[PDB]
């Protein structure tokens, strides 16, 4: 998670959710029950492995996430949102006053 | 008892009349000399034969006697265990009524002959209800009282022959009046029959369970679904096996008109059974007496519906005399299900399958000799989608027609119809099949019992498409924990390319049939270009349809056609168009997330239909079900030509290679046009030959089945030259590169 945060570099929260969903889909598709069990299909053994794999997240490493991110946009218009927030903040600062406490 | 059942073979004793009482009967129970092992039967039947047994001489473990088995109607290998039986009564004196059938037809005073053998050598103890062997009638004596005010259990002396009521029993007592053709392996549905039996038993034999549960106001069973079939007449052989109770026979109900009196007697019966233990006597002409908001828009039908609601909300769980399946008309059934009793539960009805057809065939074969080598498997397969009353009726009609044809062909059969001739002239399996093909089932179509617009093989290839469909079917049923620990299920929505008629609807129907599912085959401009305003209206309509028919795979094919490119940004029209676009975005961003709503759209370009969803903006995973690439246009054209008349030289590969840019239906149009041109040429040649023959008796003739009996390759090439190729090579390469780069 620390590596994911470092790679995020303040990526968009919606973009972060999209990346999480993409990694989840990659893990589900790469799941042995979706892959190995179908691969053997009880031909000689019920699944392609005698023991089941780990949770689908294990191990969708930094490679799968990096591939999704390279596929992911995460391309919020920083200039536009920055200008909007800056205008709102400038208005709010122009809206505020002093303590005026007797 | 034991959970695995068995079958009981014949008695170990060679003599059927020698039914030796088991040693356990006199050991575990104090079986005296005047009593034997009392056999329990169906519909509250019990018989014991006074026979002296010697347990200290020989403990023969013989099975039941043939006469004993026939009288007790004991199932083969039924678990003979003693359990609590709370439905047995007792009496002091009875009147042993004689058989009315023996009185009629006997020369002279039949009473004198009957009493002559009744006192001595009667094969019957001193009790009422003893059946005696009679000559003529060819029927059994087993009657069940629907609701008798008096009790059926009482002892009677044999020295006094009590007179009967004088009414002969013409009906076949051993059989059942209803469910004549509606007969399947367990009477239509095993689950529904079991639920009905449990409701009849627990509400009538376990009132403590209802009292502790506290459901007093519950009516009982008022089912629906199987309306209009022989399931309408499914009362007997299910309630006949279950039997009927006593007391509270009925109301008077004799005015033959019963305007409001029909409602009065119905309300009285509904209230009377709430504090009594009467049987659930099926309402004769239930739909006729109770229109149930189906017959008239005046007062009778609405009054019938309201009375049904009151009765279902005004009867205790003791009788529940409610017609099931086809109670009222299917269009407007009675409110017995709308009120308490069926308002929260459905009926586990079994679909018409080869099991019901096979059971009907077995019943018919037991009833009459169909054929020496009747292919009951073939009959069941030919009527797999039609099982029940329709299947049995069609089979009976086919057998009758085949037998009649065989008898007519054997001889005139007008002087001495030999029984051996008729039985030997059995309804041949081929003859029965032909007669059934000439006949029809009750349903308008026997193929309408499944959801299948196209076969799985009809959709050529679809290797990755079938893979995705099978994965969706499995991982949700196979490894749902894998999806749960992996997060959410994948998003739906495919983007096909090429011409229309791509088979996406056909492939979806093929998968749904292979998955035994009714995919909601959506149209094109029917979800986005919604006719009720913005796309949200059709989106909500589809959501309701999918929620009421889950899983209804909302095959919203042709997204390019679905959008329909409305436009018109002028005045309020621009507002309507923007609202439609936003509603489409919202539906693609949250809708009925169940019933596998997969929208396999048409992708004419990257922005032709919903560019934001075409980009990874709206669909996190735009799951396009890839199909194996085939010359499916060539195969379809070959099938069509086989259905038509083109043969001999067919350079199908040589021509299909010229325009390989097809989407299944793309090249089929050219094939149809060529076939039409060839047919026109053949008709013109036939007309010319006929004109020549008319001008001169020997002038011309017909060359073949067609002027071009082979493939009209000249006509096909002429049509291709008149038409144009689907797309250019550079455009095709650009489209392929664009698809690959995404």
Please give, one letter per residue, the 3-state secondary structure of B556-576.
Answer: CCCHHHHHCCCCCCCCHHHHH
Separation of alpha carbons B236 and B175, rounded Å = 9
Separation of alpha carbons B710 and B697, rounded Å = 28
User: Based on the number of CB atoms within 10 Å of its own CB, is B193 exposed (0-12), middle (13-18) or buried (19 or more)?
Assistant: buried
According to DSSP, the residues that pair with B612 across neighbouring strands are none
Give Cα separations from B296 to A25, B301, B332 (angstroms).
57, 6, 11
CB-based burial, B381-399: b 16+ in 10 Å, e otherwise: ebbbbbbbbbbbbbbbbbb
Q: Which of B552, B580, B557, B555 is nearest to B567 (CA)?
A: B580
According to DSSP, the residues that pair with B495 across neighbouring strands are B601
SS3 B312: helix
Which residues are CB-contacts of B590 (< 8 A; sequence separation ≥ 6)?
A: none
Contact criterion met (CB below 8 Å) for B92 and B156: no
Q: Tokens in use for B146?
A: 């629907």
Give CB contacts under 8 A, 24+ apart, made by B167-170: B167/B100, B168/B100, B168/B101, B168/B104, B169/B100, B169/B101, B169/B139, B169/B141, B169/B143
Separation of alpha carbons B188 and B351, rounded Å = 8
Of how many residues is chain A composed? 102
User: CA torsion angle for B44, B50, B55, B60 (degrees, to 10)?
Assistant: -70
Separation of alpha carbons B714 and B674, rounded Å = 9
Separation of alpha carbons B534 and B539, rounded Å = 9
Interface contact B697, partner A, CB < 8 A: no
Contact criterion met (CB below 8 Å) for B465 and B625: yes
Cis check for the bond before B696: say yes or no (omega within 30 of 0).
Answer: no
Q: What is the nearest CA distance from A44 to chain B, expressed in angstroms?
A: 19
Phi and psi for B685 in degrees, rounded to 5? -65, -40
Which residues are CB-contacts of B508 (< 8 A; sequence separation ≥ 6)?
A: B519, B521, B553, B555, B557, B598, B600
Separation of alpha carbons B335 and B332, rounded Å = 9
Contact criterion met (CB below 8 Å) for B14 and B91: no
Separation of alpha carbons B199 and B182, rounded Å = 21
Contact criterion met (CB below 8 Å) for B328 and B207: no
Phi and psi for B367 in degrees, rounded to 5? -75, -40
Separation of alpha carbons A72 and B159, rounded Å = 101
Tokens 């009906």 correspond to: B171
User: Based on the number of CB atoms within 10 Å of its own CB, is A15 exposed (0-12), middle (13-18) or buried (19 or more)?
Assistant: middle
Q: Which of B464, B468, B438, B465 is nearest to B454 (CA)?
A: B465
Separation of alpha carbons B258 and B623, rounded Å = 65
CB-based burial, B510-529: b 16+ in 10 Å, e otherwise: bbbbbbebbbbbbebbbbbb
For chain B, positions 164-203, list CB contacts with chain A under 8 A: none
Does the annotation list B505 as a binding residue?
yes
Q: Chain B residue with minimal CA distance to A30?
A: B486
Of A20, A28, A73, nearest to B482 by CB-CB distance is A28
| Kind and range of the H or E run holding B694 | helix B666-695
Separation of alpha carbons B627 and A54, rounded Å = 31
Q: Tokens in use for B485?
A: 């620990």
Q: Which of B354, B358, B349, B351 is nearest to B384 (CA)?
A: B354
Residues of B in contact with A21 (CB under 8 A): 487-488, 620-621
Residues of A in contact with B482 (CB under 8 A): 28, 31, 33-34, 56
Does the annotation list B504 as a binding residue?
yes
Separation of alpha carbons B490 and B350, rounded Å = 33
Tokens 């057998």 correspond to: B399
SS3 B13: coil
SS3 B130: coil
Separation of alpha carbons B329 and B287, rounded Å = 6
SS3 B96: coil
Interface contact B482, partner A, CB < 8 A: yes
Separation of alpha carbons B140 and B471, rounded Å = 58
Does the annotation list B506 as a binding residue?
yes
Q: Tokens in use for B107?
A: 């020369």
Q: Tokens in use for B568?
A: 């018109």
Contact criterion met (CB below 8 Å) for B497 and B533: no
CB-based burial, B33-61: b 16+ in 10 Å, e otherwise: eebbbebbeeebbebebeeebeeeeeeee
**Best of A19, A22, A30, A34 to mutate (most B CBs within 10 Å, chain B):** A34
Which residues are CB-contacts of B166 (< 8 A; sequence separation ≥ 6)?
A: B100
Secondary structure letter of residue B383 according to DSSP: T
Q: Chain B residue with minimal CA distance to A27?
A: B486
Contact criterion met (CB below 8 Å) for B332 and B160: no
Contact criterion met (CB below 8 Å) for B222 and B342: yes
Residues of A in contact with B487 (CB under 8 A): 20-21, 24-25, 27-28, 56
According to DSSP, the residues that pair with B601 across neighbouring strands are B495
Crossing angle of helices B389-410 and B429-438, rounded to 10°: 120
* Cβ separation A56–B486 shorter than 8 A: yes
Separation of alpha carbons B577 and B535, rounded Å = 10
Q: What is the nearest CA distance from A100 to chain B, expressed in angstroms?
A: 49
Separation of alpha carbons B156 and B129, rounded Å = 9
Separation of alpha carbons B213 and B339, rounded Å = 19
E-only strand ranges, B62-179:
none
Q: Tokens in use for B241?
A: 């096996």
Cis check for the bond before B566: say yes or no (omega within 30 of 0).
Answer: no
Q: What is the nearest CA distance from B617 to chain A, expressed in angstroms?
A: 9
Question: Other CB atoms closer than 10 Å to residue B543's CB: what's the count?
Answer: 19
Tokens 């930094």 correspond to: A62
Which residues are CB-contacts of B388 (< 8 A; sequence separation ≥ 6)?
A: B181, B182, B183, B184, B188, B226, B229, B230, B231, B352, B356, B360
Contact criterion met (CB below 8 Å) for B600 and B555: yes
Contact criterion met (CB below 8 Å) for B549 and B502: no
Please name the residue ranges forming H helices in B60-185: 66-72, 100-103, 110-119
Give the DSSP letter string of B629-672.
---HHHHHHHHHHHHTT-BS---HHHHHTTT----SSHHHHHHH
Q: What is the CA radius of gyration of chain A?
A: 24
Q: Which of B538, B535, B666, B551 is nearest to B602 (CA)?
A: B666
Contact criterion met (CB below 8 Å) for B636 and B668: yes
Of B478, B487, B616, nearest to A28 by CB-CB distance is B487
* Cβ separation B616–A72 shorter than 8 A: yes
Does the annotation list B596 as a binding residue?
no
Which residues are CB-contacts of B282 (< 8 A; sequence separation ≥ 6)?
A: B178, B235, B239, B321, B323
Q: What angle do CA B76, B80, B84 make, to 5 degrees?
A: 135
Question: Other CB atoms closer than 10 Å to residue A37's CB: what's the count?
Answer: 23
Question: Other CB atoms closer than 10 Å to residue B735's CB: what's the count?
Answer: 17
Q: What is the nearest CA distance from A62 to chain B, expressed in angstroms?
A: 16
Separation of alpha carbons B251 and B270, rounded Å = 11
Separation of alpha carbons B380 and B499, rounded Å = 41
Separation of alpha carbons B282 and B244, rounded Å = 11
Q: What is the resolution of this structure in A?
A: 6.1
Separation of alpha carbons B191 and B35, rounded Å = 39
SS3 B93: coil
Separation of alpha carbons B528 and B538, rounded Å = 7
Contact criterion met (CB below 8 Å) for B322 and B341: yes
Give CB contacts under 8 A, 24+ apart, made by B289-297: B289/B262, B290/B266, B290/B328, B290/B334, B291/B328, B291/B332, B292/B327, B292/B328, B292/B329, B292/B332, B292/B333, B292/B334, B292/B335, B293/B332, B293/B335, B294/B328, B294/B329, B294/B331, B294/B332, B294/B333
CB-based burial, B554-592: b 16+ in 10 Å, e otherwise: bbbbbbbbbbeeeeeeeeeeeeebeebbebbbebbeebb
Give Cα separations from B742 to B353, B432, B606, B607, B737 (angstroms).
46, 60, 10, 13, 9
How many helices and strands in chain B, by DSSP H and E?
27, 4
Separation of alpha carbons B647 and B718, rounded Å = 18
Interface contact B343, partner A, CB < 8 A: no
Contact criterion met (CB below 8 Å) for B333 and B292: yes
Tokens 């233990």 correspond to: B277
Q: Which of B672, B675, B631 is nearest to B653 (CA)?
A: B631
Of A22, A25, A34, nearest to B482 by CB-CB distance is A34
Phi and psi for B45 in degrees, rounded to 5? -120, 135
Q: What is the nearest CA distance from A7 to chain B, expressed in angstroms?
A: 20
Does the annotation list B297 as a binding residue?
no
Separation of alpha carbons B541 and B527, rounded Å = 9
Separation of alpha carbons B505 and B516, rounded Å = 16
Q: Tokens in use for A94?
A: 């122009």
Of A25, A31, A73, nearest to B479 by CB-CB distance is A31
Does the annotation list B229 as a binding residue?
yes
Crossing angle of helices A32-40 and B463-474, rounded to 10°: 110
Separation of alpha carbons B526 and B539, rounded Å = 9
Separation of alpha carbons B163 and B100, rounded Å = 9
Separation of alpha carbons B13 and A77, rounded Å = 97
Separation of alpha carbons B417 and B408, rounded Å = 11
* Cβ separation B487–A33 shorter than 8 A: no
Of B486, B616, B620, nearest to A31 by CB-CB distance is B486
Separation of alpha carbons B35 and B20, rounded Å = 13
| Kind and range of the H or E run holding A47 | none
Q: What angle do CA B720, B722, B723 make, to 5 degrees?
A: 60
Separation of alpha carbons B320 and B203, rounded Å = 9
Interface contact B500, partner A, CB < 8 A: no
* Cβ separation A25–B620 shorter than 8 A: yes
- Interface size A-B, in CB pairs within 8 Å, comes to 54
**Best of B479, B481, B612, B617 to mutate (most A CBs within 10 Å, chain A):** B479
Separation of alpha carbons B594 and B585, rounded Å = 18
Separation of alpha carbons B580 and B534, rounded Å = 4
Question: Other CB atoms closer than 10 Å to residue B675's CB: what's the count?
Answer: 22
Phi and psi for B291 in degrees, rounded to 5? -60, -35
Q: Chain A residue with minimal CA distance to B623?
A: A25
Phi and psi for B318 in degrees, rounded to 5? -130, -40
Residues of A in contact with B490 (CB under 8 A): 25, 28-29
């Amino acid at each position: 998670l620390e590596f994911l945060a470092k790679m995020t570099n303040g990526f968009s929260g919606a973009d972060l959710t999209e990346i999480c969903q993409r990694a989840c889909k990659l893990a589900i598709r790469e799941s042995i029950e979706s892959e190995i069990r179908r691969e053997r299909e009880r031909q000689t053994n019920p699944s392609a492995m005698e023991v089941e794999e780990d949770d689908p997240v294990p191990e969708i490493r930094r490679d799968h996430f990096e591939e999704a991110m390279r596929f992911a946009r995460r391309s919020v218009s920083d200039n536009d949102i920055r200008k909007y927030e800056m205008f709102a903040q400038t208005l709010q600062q122009s809206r505020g006053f002093g303590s005026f406490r007797f | 008892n034991r959970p695995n059942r068995l079958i009981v073979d014949e008695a170990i004793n060679e003599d059927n009349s020698v039914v030796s009482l088991s040693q356990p009967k006199m050991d575990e129970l104090q079986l005296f000399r005047g009593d034997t092992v009392l056999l329990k039967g169906k519909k509250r039947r019990e018989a014991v034969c006074i026979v002296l047994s010697d347990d200290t001489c020989s403990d023969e473990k013989i099975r039941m006697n043939r006469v004993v088995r026939n009288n007790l109607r004991v199932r083969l290998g039924d678990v003979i265990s003693i359990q609590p039986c709370p439905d047995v009564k007792y009496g002091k004196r009875i009147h042993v009524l004689p058989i009315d059938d023996t009185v009629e037809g006997i020369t002279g005073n039949l009473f004198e002959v009957y009493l002559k053998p009744y006192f001595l050598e009667a094969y019957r103890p001193i009790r009422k209800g003893d059946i005696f062997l009679v000559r003529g009638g060819m029927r059994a004596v087993e009657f069940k009282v629907v609701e008798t005010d008096p009790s059926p259990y009482c002892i009677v002396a044999p020295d006094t022959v009590i007179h009967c009521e004088g009414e002969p029993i013409k009906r076949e007592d051993e059989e059942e009046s209803l469910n004549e053709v509606g007969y399947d392996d367990i009477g239509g549905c095993r689950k529904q029959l079991a639920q009905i039996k449990e409701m009849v038993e627990l509400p009538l034999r376990h009132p403590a369970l209802f009292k502790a549960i506290g459901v007093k106001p519950p009516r009982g069973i008022l089912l629906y679904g199987p309306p209009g079939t022989g399931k309408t007449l499914i009362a007997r052989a299910v309630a006949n096996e279950t039997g009927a109770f006593f007391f509270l026979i009925n109301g008077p109900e004799i005015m033959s008109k019963l305007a409001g009196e029909s409602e009065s007697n119905l309300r009285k019966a509904f209230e009377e059974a709430e504090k009594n233990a009467p049987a659930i006597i099926f309402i004769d002409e239930l739909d006729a007496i109770a229109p149930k908001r189906e017959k008239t828009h005046g007062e009778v039908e609405r009054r019938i519906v309201s009375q049904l609601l009151t009765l279902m909300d005004g009867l205790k769980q003791r009788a529940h005399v409610i017609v099931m399946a086809a109670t009222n008309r299917p269009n407007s059934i009675d409110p017995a299900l709308r009120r308490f009793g069926r308002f929260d539960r459905e009926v586990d009805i079994g679909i018409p399958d080869a099991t019901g057809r096979l059971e009907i065939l077995q019943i018919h074969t037991k009833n009459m000799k169909l054929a020496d080598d009747v292919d009951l498997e073939q009959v069941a397969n030919e009527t797999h989608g039609h099982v029940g009353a329709d299947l049995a009726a069609l089979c009976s009609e086919a057998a009758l027609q085949a037998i009649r044809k065989k008898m007519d062909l054997i001889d005139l059969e007008d002087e001495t119809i030999d029984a051996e001739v008729m039985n030997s002239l059995a309804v041949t399996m081929d003859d029965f099949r032909w007669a059934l093909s000439q006949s029809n089932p009750s349903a308008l179509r026997e193929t309408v019992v499944e959801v299948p617009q196209v076969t799985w093989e009809d959709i050529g290839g679809l290797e990755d498409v079938k893979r995705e469909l099978q994965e969706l079917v499995q991982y949700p049923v196979e490894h749902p924990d894998k999806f749960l620990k992996f997060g959410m299920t994948p998003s739906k929505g495919v983007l096909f390319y090429g011409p229309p008629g791509c088979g996406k609807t056909l492939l979806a129907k093929a998968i749904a049939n292979e998955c035994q599912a009714n995919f909601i085959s959506i149209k094109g401009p029917e979800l986005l270009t919604m006719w009720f305003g913005e796309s949200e209206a059709n989106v909500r309509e589809i959501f309701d349809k999918a929620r009421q028919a889950a899983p209804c795979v909302l095959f919203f094919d042709e997204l390019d056609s679905i959008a329909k490119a409305r436009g018109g940004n002028i005045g309020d029209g621009g507002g309507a168009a923007d609202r439609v676009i936003n509603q489409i975005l919202t539906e693609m961003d949250g809708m009925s997330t169940k019933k596998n709503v997969f929208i396999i759209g048409a992708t004419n370009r990257p922005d032709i239909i919903d560019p934001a969803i075409l980009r990874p903006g709206r669909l996190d995973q735009l799951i396009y079900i890839p199909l194996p690439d085939e010359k499916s246009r060539v195969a379809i054209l070959k099938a069509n030509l086989r259905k038509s008349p083109v043969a001999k030289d067919v350079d199908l590969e040589f021509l299909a290679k010229m325009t390989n840019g097809f989407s299944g239906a793309d090249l089929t149009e050219i094939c149809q046009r060529a076939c039409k041109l060839a047919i026109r040429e053949s008709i013109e040649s036939e007309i010319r030959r006929e004109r020549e023959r008319q001008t001169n008796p020997s002038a011309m003739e017909v060359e073949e089945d067609d002027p071009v009996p082979e493939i009209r390759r000249d006509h096909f090439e002429e049509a291709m030259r008149f038409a144009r190729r689907s797309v250019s090579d550079n455009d095709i390469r650009k489209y392929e590169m664009f698809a690959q780069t995404l």
